[PDB]
């Protein structure tokens, strides 16, 4: 089965360097772009990082660009982020995420189960921090960018991602409306220009979690702050 | 006795053939002619369309 | 004595159709189109390049979104194209180099490929470990695959060099139903757009319409006058065209069970391969060896356009699904898109 | 003007074609070869020395490697894939020399060495295969010789007046081949008698297929 | 006279038009063809590259010059001297790897197959033509343009000295002769009946045509500025035979992509392509 392992994570002094190890298992490493994200301790999801397929292009956020270095190992089928200078700004669970970039893909599709690290631009706004819902009903989550996520190709690069609690994040809705492989039809993402709904029919135990809404317009990635499903 | 068998089954298929009902050429001839005419607007490459509708620019 | 009253019976038989054709053959298609007027010059304009086999391109197919395309050439590699930005999607190598046939399923989640390797393999291209996998390969033609075409994600129809056409279940990997009848190699075959019939040309110059629950061959389609390659059903399912190496195309009507209008020009003396509708059918493409592309005026027989922007055979042709485009494979290694500007 | 997504598909799609660059460049430098013969022409006996559909044999002799293609279990039609081989480096063609006097089992009034001929004689000429040249066995050379004793040339060539040495009717069923060849200037035939303990037919290949790349290069550049 | 200069110039353009167009096309058959990345076909595209100059830079700065009397600048003409001497030099050191390129094709034809050259290595061989170009005539020229007088002619300082003509025309006319001359007689000999004595006959007829074109087009200049230094008579008044040498070597650039590039069989393709 599809495996992403990361390792080399743990409490660092201030100043100090780590290296993160992503060991991929059961696809083909290196036809997948890899992303690193990491997710401050009750704080939503934050991008960090990007190398492609075939290690060409990489992407850094500005939070981290020059202190920190992403490489692969092809052969060994093993991501690595080289950090430096760790501030305490850095301490988060650093998540390993798969994506491969072909017309109708699906990016963003596995997560890593993540390592834990600590130290001693469109906006996506998600208004709503949280919800309180009961199964078997509907629920509606919004999103808002500051700008148009619709490109002039037809495309509208929203994402909606559910984290679980206790769970790494899974992709739910990719590119504003097409549905992830592996998801209930009772998911369904609606959206126009700055605006997008991620609809929930028949709500059920399992769909209770933060939903994140994330822009793959353009880099950085950006994510919104994320609502949640109570009961 | 291959020769046999095989001229069995080849009489056998020219009689379910021969027992088809045929309509006449001139009516097979309209459905055709109808069908290109009613489907003519849609049809790209009979009628090309505007730039601005064409995906291949 | 029984083999030769038989035979003869055969000969009263076929004297029996005949005239039956001619009974119902009171009009021509040609004096039915007289009046209506011609579709004018065709003009299309080479859109797209493909570019990236490096090999004869023997077969390509569209998918049903009318923007990826699977091409197959004997370079060893099916490569799947985006034709909206000519990006490669996919590279398949293939085991054995001597493709001759590819085809797109209609879900877009498999495609088929065969050759002289007696052998229509399955590629799987949605896996999640993000790689196309070989997911069946059909055994069972000792012939070479010349033609294969998916019904769904279970069922294909493959024809072949052995004569016959089979019909196989995916999942079992076995041939459920055997089509027999041809007396030479099945070169090409056409799906009726509701997948209950279709059509094979062999090398016997002969048409064939088969049942593909039933199994049987329903009407035998003759005219030509060498191996038939190409064949197509019209939009509407009532009629197809074929293309043979005798420079001409044929245009059969299943109802009338009888040819109805012949598209060839003195200046064509090359063979035929292939041959494909516009959308609404009034158009009616063909690849010649003489490396162009003819565009005919399907009702009146007139040749309405050229493609013409290949240096070497053009192998194969297909039009989307939504009409907008023709893609052109060619032994000169390349595919190009074409449709035409207001 | 292009997205961060298209821009990933765009340099994926450069992977691709750096791909098949490189898959492009290594078959170019192999050897292929069409393996023809007619059947019991000692064609199977060959491969085991070169060490349902089409067959192929993969092997390499100093430095170059070698792809021989066996299409004898095809029992279609020719005219639809005999131009798929069109760019081979050249054809092995297989005559066992101890059927000149054998008569070919299914039409039982065809002599078997005059099979070959005609097989020879439409693949030599074809158009598909001008400029390609042709490797010639002559095998069964041991047993050929035993049957010339007993049978002499007559039987197979009526209009042959040469004797029944061993030497001589090896070398007159040789020119009867080659004089087949209906463009002497385009392409060469090169002959060479095998046998079943021989073990210089891999290198007769070879020198074969070195002379055929010299002559390449040489009309390429335009020199011929 | 002002009529015979005006038509002398429209000839001189002529050529150098047919230099540049010429050349053109086996660098635009490159560009546009990708079947054309063999090793032949990166030297055939060096070779078209310093031919076409030759009728861009050098043969158009030239016709004012000698015909209308422009009076060169002390700038330009050292420019003009040193890039036509580096265009013609290394046209004779493609020639010269063209024929050591079809040497090896045929001497060790299997190592010649079966070897992966990549860019970066031919590359190396292209650039390396150019930089030797340069150094056989490129500081010579530059060193001793102090040597000439004011108001002299815009010919390279050392014609003074015969021995340094000597030494310039052994490295760049009688060592690529040499060369030339051997690999073709190699190319001759990798052969080892009416057919193949005809086919000998006709691929000896070949590589005397090559051969005795750049020696026809390079041996006269090349010769006669010597035994002029010789003489002391390489500054003054030039006669006709002189100038008529010193165009010989110019119409080599107009014949290279005849005999090279148009022979091949690959470059044949593409030039139908691009036109039909
Ligand atoms: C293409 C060929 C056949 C015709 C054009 C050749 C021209 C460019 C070359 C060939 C011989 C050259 C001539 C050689 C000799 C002289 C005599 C001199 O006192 C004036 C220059 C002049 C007249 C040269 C002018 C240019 C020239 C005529
Ligand atoms: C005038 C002397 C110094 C020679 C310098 C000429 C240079 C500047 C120009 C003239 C010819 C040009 C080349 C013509 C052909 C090609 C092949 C193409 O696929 C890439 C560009 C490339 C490689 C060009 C690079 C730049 C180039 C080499
Ligand atoms: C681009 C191709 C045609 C090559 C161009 C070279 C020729 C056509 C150009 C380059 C130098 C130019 C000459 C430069 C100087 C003069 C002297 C002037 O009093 C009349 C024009 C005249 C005579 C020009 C005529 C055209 C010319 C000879
Ligand atoms: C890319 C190609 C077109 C470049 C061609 C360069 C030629 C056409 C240009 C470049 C330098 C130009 C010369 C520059 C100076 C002079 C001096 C003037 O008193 C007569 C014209 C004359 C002689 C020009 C003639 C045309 C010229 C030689
Ligand atoms: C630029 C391309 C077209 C040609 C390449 C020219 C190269 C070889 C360089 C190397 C040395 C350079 C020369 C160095 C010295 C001088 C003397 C100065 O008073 C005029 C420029 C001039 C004459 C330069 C011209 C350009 C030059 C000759
Ligand atoms: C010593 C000085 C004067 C030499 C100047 C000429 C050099 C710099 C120029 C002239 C021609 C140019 C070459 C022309 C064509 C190619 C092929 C291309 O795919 C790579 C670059 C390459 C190989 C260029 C390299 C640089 C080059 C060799
Ligand atoms: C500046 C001085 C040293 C230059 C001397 C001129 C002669 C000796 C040089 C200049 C050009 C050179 C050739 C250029 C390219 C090649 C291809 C290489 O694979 C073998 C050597 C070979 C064949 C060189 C042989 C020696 C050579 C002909
Ligand atoms: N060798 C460059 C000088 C020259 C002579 N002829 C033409 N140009």
Redesign the interface.
Same mark, same amino acid.
């Given at each position: 089965d599809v495996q992403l392992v990361e390792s080399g994570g743990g409490l660092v002094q201030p100043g100090g360097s780590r290296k993160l190890s992503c060991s991929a298992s059961g696809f083909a490493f290196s036809s997948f772009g890899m992303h690193w994200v990491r997710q401050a301790p009750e704080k939503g999801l934050e991008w960090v990082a990007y190398i492609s397929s075939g290690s060409g292009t990489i992407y850094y956020a500005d939070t981290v660009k020059g202190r920190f270095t992403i490489s692969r190992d092809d052969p060994k089928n093993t991501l690595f982020l080289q950090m430096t200078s760790l501030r305490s700004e850095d301490t988060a669970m650093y998540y390993c995420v798969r994506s491969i970039y072909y017309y109708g893909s699906s990016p963003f599709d596995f997560w890593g189960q993540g390592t834990t690290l600590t130290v001693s631009d469109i906006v996506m706004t998600q208004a709503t921090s949280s919800v309180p819902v009961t199964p078997g009903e509907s629920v509606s989550i919004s999103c808002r960018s500051s700008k148009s996520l619709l490109h002039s190709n037809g495309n509208t690069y929203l994402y909606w991602f559910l984290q679980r609690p206790g769970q790494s994040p899974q992709l739910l809705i990719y590119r504003m409306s097409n549905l992830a492989s592996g998801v209930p039809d009772r998911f369904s993402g609606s959206g126009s220009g700055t605006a997008f709904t991620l609809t929930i029919s028949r709500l059920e135990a399992e769909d209770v979690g933060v939903y994140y809404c994330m822009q793959h317009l353009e880099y950085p990635l950006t994510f919104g702050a994320g609502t949640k499903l109570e009961l | 006795t291959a020769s046999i068998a095989q001229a069995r089954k080849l009489v056998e298929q020219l009689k379910m053939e021969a027992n088809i009902d045929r309509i006449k050429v001139s009516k097979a001839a309209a459905d055709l002619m109808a069908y290109c005419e009613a489907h003519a607007k849609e049809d790209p490459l009979l009628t090309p369309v505007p730039a601005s509708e064409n995906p291949f620019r | 004595s029984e083999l030769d009253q038989l035979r003869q019976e055969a000969e009263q038989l076929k004297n029996q159709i005949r005239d039956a054709r001619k009974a119902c053959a009171d009009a021509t298609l040609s004096q039915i189109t007289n009046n209506i007027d011609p579709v004018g010059r065709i003009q299309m304009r080479t859109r797209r390049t493909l570019r990236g086999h490096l090999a004869k391109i023997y077969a390509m197919h569209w998918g049903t979104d009318s923007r990826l395309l699977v091409s197959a050439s004997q370079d060893g590699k099916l490569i799947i194209w985006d034709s909206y930005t000519t990006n490669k999607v996919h590279a398949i190598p293939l085991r054995s180099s001597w493709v001759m046939t590819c085809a797109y399923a209609p879900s877009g989640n498999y495609v088929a490929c065969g050759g002289l390797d007696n052998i229509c393999s399955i590629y799987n291209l949605k896996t999640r470990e993000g790689n196309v996998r070989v997911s069946r390969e059909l055994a069972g033609h000792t012939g070479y695959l010349s033609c294969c075409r998916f019904l769904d994600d279970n069922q294909i129809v493959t024809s072949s060099g052995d004569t016959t056409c089979a019909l196989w279940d995916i999942e079992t990997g076995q041939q459920t139903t055997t089509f027999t009848g041809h007396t030479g190699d099945v070169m090409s075959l056409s799906l009726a757009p509701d997948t209950r019939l279709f059509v094979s040309g062999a090398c016997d110059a002969s048409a064939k319409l088969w049942d593909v629950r039933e199994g049987m061959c329903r009407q035998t389609f003759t005219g030509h006058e060498s191996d038939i390659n190409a064949i197509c059903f019209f939009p509407n399912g009532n009629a197809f065209a074929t293309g043979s190496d005798d420079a001409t195309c044929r245009l059969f009507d299943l109802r009338a069970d009888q040819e109805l209008m012949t598209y060839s020009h003195d200046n064509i003396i090359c063979g035929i391969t292939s041959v494909s509708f516009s959308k609404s059918g009034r158009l009616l493409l063909a690849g010649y060896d003489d490396f162009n592309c003819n565009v005919w005026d399907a009702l009146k027989a007139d040749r309405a356009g050229v493609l013409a922007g290949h240096d070497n055979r053009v192998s194969c042709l297909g039009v989307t699904d939504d009409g907008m485009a023709v893609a052109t494979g060619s032994w000169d290694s390349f595919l190009k898109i074409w449709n035409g500007s207001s | 003007t292009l997205? %961060?997504?298209?821009? #990933? #598909?765009?340099? =994926?799609?450069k992977?691709?074609?750096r !791909?098949?660059r490189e898959? /492009?460049?290594k %078959?170019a =430098?192999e050897v292929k070869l069409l393996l023809l013969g007619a059947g019991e022409s000692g064609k199977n006996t060959i491969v085991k020395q070169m060490k349902? /559909?089409?067959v192929?044999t993969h092997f390499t002799f $100093?430095?170059?490697?070698f792809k021989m293609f066996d299409?004898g279990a095809?029992?279609?039609?020719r005219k639809?894939?005999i131009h798929?081989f069109e760019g081979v480096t050249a054809i092995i063609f297989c005559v066992a020399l101890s059927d000149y006097d054998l008569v070919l089992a299914e039409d039982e009034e065809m002599n078997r060495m005059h099979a070959s001929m005609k097989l020879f004689d439409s693949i030599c000429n074809n158009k598909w295969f001008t400029d390609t040249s042709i490797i010639l066995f002559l095998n069964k050379k041991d047993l050929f010789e035993e049957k010339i004793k007993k049978s002499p040339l007559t039987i197979c060539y009526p209009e042959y007046a040469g004797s029944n040495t061993y030497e001589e009717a090896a070398a007159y069923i040789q020119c009867q081949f080659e004089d087949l060849n209906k463009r $002497?200037?385009t392409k060469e035939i090169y002959t060479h008698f095998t046998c079943s303990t021989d073990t210089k037919n891999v290198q007769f290949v070879f020198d074969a297929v070195?002379d055929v *790349? *010299?002559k390449n !290069?040489? $009309?390429?550049? /335009?020199?011929? | 006279s002002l009529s015979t200069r005006v038509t002398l110039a429209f000839f001189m353009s002529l050529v150098a038009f047919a230099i540049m167009l010429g050349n053109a096309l086996v660098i635009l058959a490159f560009v546009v063809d990708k079947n054309l990345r063999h090793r032949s076909s990166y030297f055939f595209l060096n070779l078209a590259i310093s031919d076409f100059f030759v009728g861009v830079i050098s043969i158009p700065l030239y016709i004012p010059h000698t015909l209308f009397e422009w009076d060169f600048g002390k700038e330009i003409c050292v420019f003009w001297l040193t890039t036509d001497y580096l265009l013609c030099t290394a046209s004779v050191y493609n020639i010269v790897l063209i024929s050591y390129d079809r040497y090896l094709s045929v001497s060790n034809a299997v190592s010649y197959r079966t070897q992966h050259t990549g860019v970066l290595k031919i590359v190396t061989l292209m650039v390396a033509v150019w930089v030797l170009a340069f150094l056989v005539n490129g500081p010579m020229i530059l060193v001793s343009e102090s040597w000439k007088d004011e108001g002299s002619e815009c010919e390279p300082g050392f014609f003074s000295e015969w021995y340094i003509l000597a030494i310039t025309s052994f490295l760049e006319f009688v060592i690529p002769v040499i060369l030339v001359a051997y690999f073709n007689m190699n190319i001759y000999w990798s052969l080892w009946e009416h057919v193949e004595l005809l086919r000998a006959r006709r691929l000896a007829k070949s590589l005397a045509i090559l051969l005795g074109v750049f020696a026809v087009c390079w041996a006269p200049y090349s010769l006669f500025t010597i035994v002029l230094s010789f003489y002391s008579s390489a500054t003054g008044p030039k006669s006709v035979w002189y100038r008529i040498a010193f165009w010989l070597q110019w119409f080599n650039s107009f014949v290279n992509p005849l005999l090279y590039p148009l022979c091949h069989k690959r470059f044949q393709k593409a030039f139908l392509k691009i036109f039909c």
């Open positions: - | - | - | 997205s %961060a997504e298209d821009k #990933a #598909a765009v340099e =994926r799609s992977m691709i074609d !791909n098949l898959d /492009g460049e %078959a =430098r349902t /559909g089409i192929e $100093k430095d170059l490697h299409v095809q029992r279609s039609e639809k894939w798929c $002497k200037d070195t *790349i *010299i !290069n040489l $009309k390429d550049c /335009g020199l011929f | -």
